[PDB]
Amino acid sequence: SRIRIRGYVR
Amino acid sequence: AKPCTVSTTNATVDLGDLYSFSLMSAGAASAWHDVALELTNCPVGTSRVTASFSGAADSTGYYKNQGTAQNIQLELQDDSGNTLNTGATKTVQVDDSSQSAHFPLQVRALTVNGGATQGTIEAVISITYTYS
Ligand SMILES: [Co+2]
């Protein structure tokens, strides 16, 4: 299994 | 022991927009985000499932941000508040009434050192299962 983490710091 | 069926091949946590203003002090972190891993159809003879976690760490030991925001670590925790950094494991007992196993996990961004900078957040944590 794979857990992808995404986001932005603003 | 024989393998269960892995019923969560891919999961995604979208942390959304975090603010450098609130990721300035050391130890500041985002809210936790839930992610679960499901196993089903566990065969006769299998009473426990062990998940093993991998992916690149940075100097802090947490998972490295592969994106452009600096001073951002990614942290995965189990149901006991343990950090599951690279090489960690977590074992769960199969529910015999359903021949299934569930891994409730949480993810957040953390700034160990403080002073996060603007940019993207991207990481991938891989999970490989053994059965006993
Ligand atoms: Co969020």
Side-chain angles (χ1 to χ4, degrees):
Chain A
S1 304
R2 282 164 76 255
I3 295 173
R4 187 279 184 99
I5 304 164
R6 64 191 294 172
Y8 281 84
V9 178
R10 305 296 183 166
Chain B
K2 305 288 172 75
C4 308
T5 296
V6 175
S7 293
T8 314
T9 301
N10 282 289
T12 298
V13 170
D14 172 20
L15 302 170
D17 287 341
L18 306 180
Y19 297 94
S20 68
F21 180 99
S22 296
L23 292 165
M24 185 176 322
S25 185
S30 73
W32 293 110
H33 301 254
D34 294 330
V35 57
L37 303 178
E38 309 299 342
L39 298 95
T40 55
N41 302 336
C42 293
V44 175
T46 298
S47 55
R48 289 180 164 68
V49 180
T50 300
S52 179
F53 301 86
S54 61
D58 63 27
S59 67
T60 74
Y62 296 96
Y63 295 100
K64 181 172 198 325
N65 185 20
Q66 303 290 343
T68 62
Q70 302 300 305
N71 309 314
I72 292 290
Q73 282 69 51
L74 293 314
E75 180 173 16
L76 181 66
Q77 278 185 15
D78 74 4
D79 61 6
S80 297
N82 300 304
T83 300
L84 299 169
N85 281 336
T86 194
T89 71
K90 176 67 173 184
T91 299
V92 297
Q93 291 182 274
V94 172
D95 182 334
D96 280 337
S97 70
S98 54
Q99 308 91 63
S100 61
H102 178 71
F103 290 84
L105 308 169
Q106 298 77 48
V107 167
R108 69 184 178 178
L110 168 66
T111 178
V112 170
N113 297 136
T117 65
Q118 72 171 71
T120 57
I121 302 171
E122 286 295 342
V124 175
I125 302 169
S126 300
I127 310 89
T128 76
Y129 310 89
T130 63
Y131 303 93
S132 61

